[PDB]
Design a protein around this ligand. Sequence first.
Ligand SMILES: CC(C)(C)C(=O)N[C@@H](C(=O)NO)c1ccc(Br)cc1
Ligand SMILES: CC(C)(C)C(=O)N[C@@H](C(=O)NO)c1ccc(Br)cc1
Ligand SMILES: CC(C)(C)C(=O)N[C@@H](C(=O)NO)c1ccc(Br)cc1
Ligand SMILES: [Zn+2]
Ligand SMILES: [Zn+2]
Ligand SMILES: [Zn+2]
Ligand SMILES: [Zn+2]
Ligand SMILES: [Zn+2]
Ligand SMILES: [Zn+2]
Lengths: 517, 513, 519
Amino acid sequence: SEVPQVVSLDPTSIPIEYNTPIHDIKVQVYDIKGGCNVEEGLTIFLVNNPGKENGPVKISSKVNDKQVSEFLKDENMEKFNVKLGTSKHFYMFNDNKNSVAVGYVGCGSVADLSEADMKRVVLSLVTMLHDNKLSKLTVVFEINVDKNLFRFFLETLFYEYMTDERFKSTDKNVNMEYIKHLGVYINNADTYKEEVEKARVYYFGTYYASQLIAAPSNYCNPVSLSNAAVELAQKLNLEYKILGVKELEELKMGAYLSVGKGSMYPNKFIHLTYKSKGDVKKKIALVGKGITFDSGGYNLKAAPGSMIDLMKFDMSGCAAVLGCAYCVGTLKPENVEIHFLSAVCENMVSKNSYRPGDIITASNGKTIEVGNTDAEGRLTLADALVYAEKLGVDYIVDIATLTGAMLYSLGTSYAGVFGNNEELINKILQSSKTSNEPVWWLPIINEYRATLNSKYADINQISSVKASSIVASLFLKEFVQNTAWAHIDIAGVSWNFKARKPKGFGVRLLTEFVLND
Amino acid sequence: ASEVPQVVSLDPTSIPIEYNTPIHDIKVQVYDIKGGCNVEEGLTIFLVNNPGKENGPVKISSKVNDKQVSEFLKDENMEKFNVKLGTSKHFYMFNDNKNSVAVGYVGCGSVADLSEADMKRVVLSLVTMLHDNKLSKLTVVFEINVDKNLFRFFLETLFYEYMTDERFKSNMEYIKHLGVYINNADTYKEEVEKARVYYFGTYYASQLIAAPSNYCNPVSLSNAAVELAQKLNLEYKILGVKELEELKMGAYLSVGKGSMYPNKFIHLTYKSKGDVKKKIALVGKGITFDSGGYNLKAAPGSMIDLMKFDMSGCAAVLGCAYCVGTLKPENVEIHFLSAVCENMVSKNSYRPGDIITASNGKTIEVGNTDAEGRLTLADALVYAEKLGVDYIVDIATLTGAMLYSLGTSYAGVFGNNEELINKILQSSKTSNEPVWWLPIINEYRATLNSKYADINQISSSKASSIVASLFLKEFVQNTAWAHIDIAGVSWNFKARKPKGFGVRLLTEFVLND
Amino acid sequence: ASEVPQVVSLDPTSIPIEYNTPIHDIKVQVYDIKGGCNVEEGLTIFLVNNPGKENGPVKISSKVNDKQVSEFLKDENMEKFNVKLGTSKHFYMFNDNKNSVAVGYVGCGSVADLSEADMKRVVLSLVTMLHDNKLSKLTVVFEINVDKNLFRFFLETLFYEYMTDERFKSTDKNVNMEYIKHLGVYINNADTYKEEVEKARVYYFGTYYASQLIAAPSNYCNPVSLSNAAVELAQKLNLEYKILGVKELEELKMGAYLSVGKGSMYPNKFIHLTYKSKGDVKKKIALVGKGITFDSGGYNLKAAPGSMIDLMKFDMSGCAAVLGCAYCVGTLKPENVEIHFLSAVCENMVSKNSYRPGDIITASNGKTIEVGNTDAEGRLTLADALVYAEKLGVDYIVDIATLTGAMLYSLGTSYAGVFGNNEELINKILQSSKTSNEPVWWLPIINEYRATLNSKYADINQISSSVKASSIVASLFLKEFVQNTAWAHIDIAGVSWNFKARKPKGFGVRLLTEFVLND
Ligand SMILES: CC(C)(C)C(=O)N[C@@H](C(=O)NO)c1ccc(Br)cc1
Ligand SMILES: CC(C)(C)C(=O)N[C@@H](C(=O)NO)c1ccc(Br)cc1
Ligand SMILES: CC(C)(C)C(=O)N[C@@H](C(=O)NO)c1ccc(Br)cc1
Ligand SMILES: [Zn+2]
Ligand SMILES: [Zn+2]
Ligand SMILES: [Zn+2]
Ligand SMILES: [Zn+2]
Ligand SMILES: [Zn+2]
Ligand SMILES: [Zn+2]
């Protein structure tokens, strides 16, 4: 529990903001058929023109202001078009002789917005929120949107609006000022009002994961990460258990323990549990890869393009699980039992580190020949999956930044899912649709299994086939004997390279999976 | 036919092709296993397994009508051998008639349902025994469960691996008879001659791919396509440089600028005798050699010595043309297309940064001369859509990223039409040529926005297989279109030979449509 | 013995060693071919060739004491088969007593004198017949010409390849493993070859023992656990032993050897085994083996492509070969000779305590060395070991080491290179290469390259810069640490590991033993 230090200036805990400015925003949803009030702050219309690409802007909503309504006549709006991402600011006086701000955001010509298009709309909307000291924002929906995408709008809006300044000191933004009120005019308002607070939950779950990922490896260490998981569990009244080295040794987790041998931080196994009141119909284990830093070990990440400066995100799998734990622990689903697991450690270079060629024994008795110390994720997951299966669960779902090969297969937008059970895989895909975190199904090709046959050990850690994502899945499959299991590789989608910040991918995906099961 | 240019007189002027293979001379009969096996001649191999008992002992269940062989096949003798997948034993002995015979087995593991990859290992083990056999007859006894498709796949694979290409060469003898004992023999009899057609179609493609680039050039390959067309009574048309210029195929012509061999566009056609209800275009990548261009393949692992394989798309299409022209499906019209050229470094060569104009009017900024396949296919796809077909399916060794995504066993399929995707996947199942559906992610489309041209050839930077699909997608306007990337599965690296991947897949596609 | 340090309790504290192998339970019987062949239980294999006739027909010349089998193996029936090297066939038939017997052959090509490489292909072909078949007896009939050494090499290679290492198997132990209990050998002039049998069984395990160590991973085989194995072996053979720790090494001022191991969690251990004859000693020999239990390369990390860092447990081979030699010598017990088995064991790791590139260190003989590359750690350890060896007052010093990767580019994977300062000793090793059938080639120490080892500040450079012939330069470095004794250096970096078979060869054991025996 006590974080070790090299010097006194070393941080002993992860700075975490629980009360974010977003939580201070009062959100009201009105019915658009009742008319719009344009009084204070900025009012933004989400408009489109179906079939007519770059078509003119037309405000259909009734505005309860004679002056504003005249400004928004079709003749005045014709000069502007609805191209996706386009935004404009209007300045005018209303009926009560007050200066007001109005605008719009282009939503293209397609009636059904993609999750990427809606992301483009929101990102465009946030630009109007930045560098402007507004106290209230009003969004008028003049497009058709369902409950999931409406919730997705709010989640994305909240996430992008917030700015992480935990590690700023002399460069804190002197102009950062968040809105205090949020008004939303939309079709059939009563059906959408419930999505508001669910969005706020999904938001913080994602951003909590984001805070964990963005934190550097000197702040976020195997100990400090475990201490944070406890504090989270304590706040959510979740049962929690942190396994130390001695307990791991008794469980004979040689693969997981080997990875952390070269670290100054002791290995920590995170075990959070949520149990519903009443009869449990489904028991689920969510496993997150929690490598606080990945140097690669003696197979050091020194080659060009190894992205070692980023490798602090190698616990994004764990972060997604903890973020999910917040959401599950907050919304409190029924008839489910969830186990949040993470074999947390750090992959470093030392006299104590494990070497390429070392043969280690997993907690299930299988001997493993290490061919590459930078393939440490599958080793920690190996023991983690064995632990998970011993819990006697119905579903085992792991999430990990496992292979860099994902950048060559699916890229930076779609995560890959592997599994031994098509039913569970379909459940993940359905969750991907409703959570709007895109996932593509990839195969576990059994023909490659022969390349993992070790001459001396029971199995090789790596192949010597270049299809790393599939070969890694073959390895993990060997540690789930008779349980439905799925493996989500998020190595390519976890980090937003364009925005230079985490996505917190997985929180919404896993939560929708647990809730809609 | 056109005259192939030469640098020296010793330069070959034709691709050697073997049409009459020893496989075509093998008489194949299928017997029902319920009647017991007759072991009087040649080599007899039992395909056995042991379900639930991993690496379990061998036990021959079938009754054999020979006392000498029956004593050999008794359980006490066979239990000394195990059923580990691929494991083989065979013994020489005299039968009841004092004739010299050979009897043995191939282990088929402990799984009741064999994959196509498992069947490959079984066949390879079987072929090893054959390449060491002088006997005239091989008898295969199925004491395992296989359906019609897997049995035909067994025959296709056996025939293919058995055959050895010695065209460029300067022990054993091939068998004359093949006996097969299997449950429901009458049901599998129909698969025999279909397998033999799928055989040569795959092997013909293999012959073209294996043929080096000094033998297989744009002109000689087009000549081979013509000769094949004449044998199959197919309508054919070979477009030359002057006509390609008239059709304004700038993207295609730019790739072949640096070659000593003129660009040649292959157009074969199969038309049904009855009313035509479906028109299909099959498009093959036809780079006889890919040096990479001025973006030379110089980096380690760029595999420049294998770059004769860069035609595999063309070979697969031409191989399908054989199967289609032989089996002669009804109510369908199929167009076999291939923009064939050579990718070389010269003063006349296309350069990185060059802006070229495709036959559809789109200007393309070349960011990498080694991404030439999508360029040649671009004009090919524009040609294909002009034919007014229902389905367009292109197959190509397009991106090396496939080796990092699906590997060397599974090919990737991309497309703009899900129903067409499903038809390819269904064809993958029946042909036993494994293919996996990969997404065309539209969020990556923006990375192709050129500052000066209409579109970029390549991306700034990662998912190159998806980016390449996004590029090809820009050249099919209103037709169901699918794209098969076989760069990873085309070459059998372990065996040092082609697979002929795609031939059976494409044929099953047009047959079961 | 020392206690092996651990990071976690699950870290192994000893090298698993199998002394009693199934090969040791095999009874070997040798018969003269002129007496006729008996074909009964198990598998009976004929070794046939056809001199001058490439892929010629099979012809069994030996008399078979069975009417049925003799008819089966008549020339008319065997014509259909050929003698192509490595080709093998299985025969099934009933003998005179109405019993079913298994007979077969292995093709030995068309050359009358088989090379060592050809013989291994024959044996490997023979082993395939032993695998996946539950035989109780193997019978080998020699219808080819072999000398006493080649006959012994056959048995050694057969025993070695037949054996399977399952020390590190757990849930993937081969359930079908069942070794033969009897081995029959039919050969002309049998009594002359019978003496080679037990020599082969001793040479086999000596090779396999070294192989067991080499194949053993670095977390199992560390400087402490490896030295412990040497003690255990010496005790079983009643060899004198001394294991020097850091304190003793510090007192002997072995700065070069100690500097390599600075960055390791495992303390340095210097292995010193001694065999003395019970009679007057006429010859004194020191055998030095490189003993790096793992070579990460140091701060000159093995990060370049093809640097094979996952293999770097194999950096043991020299020490393992010397220990394997100690077994053969301790078992066969040669006369009038005293052998010193030496190895400076340590581990080259990256740490805060690690030695740096540029560091100047002092060897035990006073020479100062400027470190230009931490991955050239072998010659540094050998430097102190060669000084130690020469202080023993011996007649010959022979070192064996996986020293330079340049050997893969020079001699390849089959032939080891030998360097030296004494021509007569070099020729003795070459003769040992002949009799042991472990291929060794003589490579030159080119003195013109010595000037590139001239350090600006230290007495001598660890490595060169302008040569790129690392193997020769490494020898030039080592020569500077042997003042006035015949010394030879065997670089086995290329031949130690069998890449195709993914296993060690145990190269050096038979070579060094033949060297000690015939001297
Ligand atoms: C093949 C290899 C380079 C070893 C790899 O995929 N490494 C993982 C990794 O660090 N596993 O622990 C990896 C994962 C994500 C990214 Br981005 C890069 C590399
Ligand atoms: C990104 C780049 C390395 C240029 C590539 O995808 N090359 C293709 C190619 O040359 N297509 O024409 C490629 C295709 C197959 C193989 Br194997 C390697 C490279
Ligand atoms: C010149 C250099 C490439 C540094 C070399 O010879 N290295 C040794 C070595 O690491 N000695 O300690 C070496 C030895 C064996 C093999 Br395989 C590769 C490199
Ligand atoms: Zn890693
Ligand atoms: Zn990692
Ligand atoms: Zn190319
Ligand atoms: Zn190409
Ligand atoms: Zn080294
Ligand atoms: Zn070394």
